[PDB]
């Protein structure tokens, strides 16, 4: 399930709160999404998880 590095600008600045950026191409389009750090969720990992 192949995943690639984001453009520098996205890699550095897209994901917040110590998340990691990953990129997929779907239908020849780059989709930049993120792997959230423990306790965060949201698209840019911006929201704190509630128990």
């Amino acid at each position: 399930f192949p995943t690639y590095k984001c453009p520098e600008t996205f890699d550095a600045w897209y994901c917040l709160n110590d998340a990691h950026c990953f990129a997929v191409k779907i239908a020849d389009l780059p989709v930049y999404s993120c792997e959230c750090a423990i306790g965060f969720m949201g698209q840019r990992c911006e929201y704190k998880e509630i128990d």
Binding site: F1, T9, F10, W13, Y14, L16, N17, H20, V24, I26, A27, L29, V31, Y32, S33, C34, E35, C36, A37, I38, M41, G42, Q43, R44, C45, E46, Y47, K48, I50, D51
Partner: protein
């Protein structure tokens, strides 16, 4: 008939996928009707149970299925997808009510699915998936292959295509199937004049409005209506609006006789907020005589970029969320997913802007962490949180989660109109467990969660425990003003043991002292000569 709230994180996931699975199971099991988008992503291991899907009947937003490798995905009871929120890959391009991609299931069985009300259907780059090419999506969508593995014929049983192997699995038709006299609707037999009322959604069992499966717009009295019974009903014969004794307020897909009361009433509707022509009056969304009080829209996250807007606001329409990134500062992203402008870190001293604030129509959410973000005295003049819009599945009007706060300090907060209090995992926060929140909340049905804050004993030893001058109701901080309710006497919003302590105080009530008229030093009473 349980509700559940859909997520909206798209292809993003928790690092821990087992956690992720358990997150979905929690959210969706026993769910009938999902409000929002249901995103079923990153089940990378076959043999995950997937039972939570079993009860879902309606999804208001889009359904997105991505990176799921369970062999067979079944939505046993899903019949309609409203697609009121749609999924996109770039701002230009199709918006999807259903999109499955990069996924390893052998079959996606959504039998019994009748209607996708808005948005398109998409499948991209997912092998082993079958029978989707055999499905007529023209039948399911209003307007808008090469699987490499075998691919079992549909059962002999059924005339068109199928969702999967069963005779249970062939696609049925309620729409394309019936007479042309039914344009705009589904239809319950194939004869012309066997069609269902244009008011409902996803089929119907007969011609009348009591008869469809779901209500397209409003459900009232067990009958679908397109519009709630009007307060003023028009008469076409004599050209006049009459007053309607049968009139009812529109309250999100139901018609109610009186509004919830934490809501406003626009002409025919229970509303969250007045539109630009009009303004709040007691209850009603009345029009502005002359000027319209300028107002302050809530912000999605509070940051150094938007803080200025809140200067001099008495009422915040919307909500206030101060999150970690508020203090740390962050880059913004435009809706194109091009990087926008960077935001300098916010300094808690700048939150003073809210001191003018008296009411919050949405919810207050404080999760931000910072060495100097100690109290919440910026909101010292805030007196009510309306809770017209709540936060998370907890349904919180006031959520304080993992903030750096030590005390609340919100002296004037008298009311939370609707929704719950949730205050958890604030490590040196005090007072919060001794605050009798019910006092503050408008209705006893409203709930409170207070857990994992600085332990009560540990506050006591520090002596951050609240005046003697206040009752069992608790308090927002240590000081005499802080107390929610004075124990004995109240003088100038200060809690005092006995009026006599202050010479300039005279005993106005049984629970009050007022200051003595400039004129004289010590009064018996409340006068210019009286003293």
């Amino acid at each position: 008939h349980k509700i559940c709230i859909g997520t909206k994180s798209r292809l993003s996931v928790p690092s821990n996928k087992e956690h992720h699975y358990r997150n979905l199971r929690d959210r969706y099991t026993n769910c009938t009707y999902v409000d929002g988008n249901l995103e079923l992503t990153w089940l990378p291991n076959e043999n995950l149970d997937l039972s939570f899907l079993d009860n879902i009947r309606e999804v208001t937003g889009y359904i997105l299925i991505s990176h799921v490798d369970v062999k067979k995905v079944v939505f046993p009871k899903l019949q309609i997808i409203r697609g009121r929120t749609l999924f996109s890959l770039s701002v230009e391009e199709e918006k999807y009510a259903l999109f499955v991609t990069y996924s390893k299931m052998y079959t996606l069985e959504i039998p019994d699915l009748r209607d996708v009300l808005n948005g398109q259907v998409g499948f991209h780059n997912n092998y082993n998936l079958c029978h989707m090419r055999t499905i007529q999506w023209s039948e399911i969508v209003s307007n808008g292959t090469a699987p490499e593995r075998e691919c079992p014929k549909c059962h002999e049983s059924c005339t068109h295509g199928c969702w999967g192997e069963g005779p249970k699995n062939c696609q049925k038709f309620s729409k394309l199937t019936c007479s042309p006299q039914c344009a705009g609707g589904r239809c319950y037999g194939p004869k012309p004049r066997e069609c269902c009322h244009l008011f409902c959604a996803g089929g119907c069992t007969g011609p009348t409005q009591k008869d469809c499966i779901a209500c397209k717009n409003f459900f009232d009295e067990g009958v679908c209506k397109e519009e709630c019974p009007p307060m003023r009903k028009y008469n076409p014969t004599t050209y006049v609006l009459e007053t309607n004794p049968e009139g009812k307020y529109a309250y999100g897909a139901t018609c109610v006789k009186e509004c919830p009361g934490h809501l406003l009433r626009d002409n025919g509707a229970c509303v969250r907020s007045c539109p630009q022509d009009k303004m709040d009056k007691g209850g009603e969304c009345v029009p502005c005589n002359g000027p319209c009080p300028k107002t302050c829209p809530g912000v999605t996250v509070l940051h150094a970029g938007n803080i200025d807007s809140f200067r001099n606001c008495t009422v915040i329409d919307g909500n206030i969320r101060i999150l970690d990134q508020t203090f740390s500062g962050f880059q913004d992203v435009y809706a194109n997913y091009t990087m926008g402008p960077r935001y300098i870190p916010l300094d808690p001293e700048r939150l003073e802007v809210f001191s003018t604030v008296k009411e919050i129509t949405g919810y207050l959410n404080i999760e931000g962490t910072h060495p100097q973000f100690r109290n919440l005295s910026y909101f010292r003049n805030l007196e009510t949180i309306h809770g017209r819009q709540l936060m998370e599945s907890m349904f919180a009007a006031l959520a304080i989660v993992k903030s750096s706060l030590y005390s609340l300090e919100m002296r004037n907060l008298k009311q939370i109109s609707s929704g719950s209090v949730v205050i958890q995992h604030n490590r040196d926060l005090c007072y919060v467990s001794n605050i009798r929140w019910p006092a503050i909340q408008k209705e006893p049905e409203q709930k409170v969660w207070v857990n994992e804050n600085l332990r009560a004993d540990l506050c006591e030893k520090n002596g951050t425990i609240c005046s003697d001058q206040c009752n069992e109701d608790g308090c927002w901080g240590a000081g005499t003003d802080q107390c929610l309710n004075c124990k004995n006497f109240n003088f100038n919003g200060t809690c005092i043991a006995d009026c006599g302590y202050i010479s300039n105080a005279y005993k106005f009530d049984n629970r009050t002292c007022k200051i003595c008229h400039p004129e004289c030093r010590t009064c018996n009473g409340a006068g210019a000569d009286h003293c």
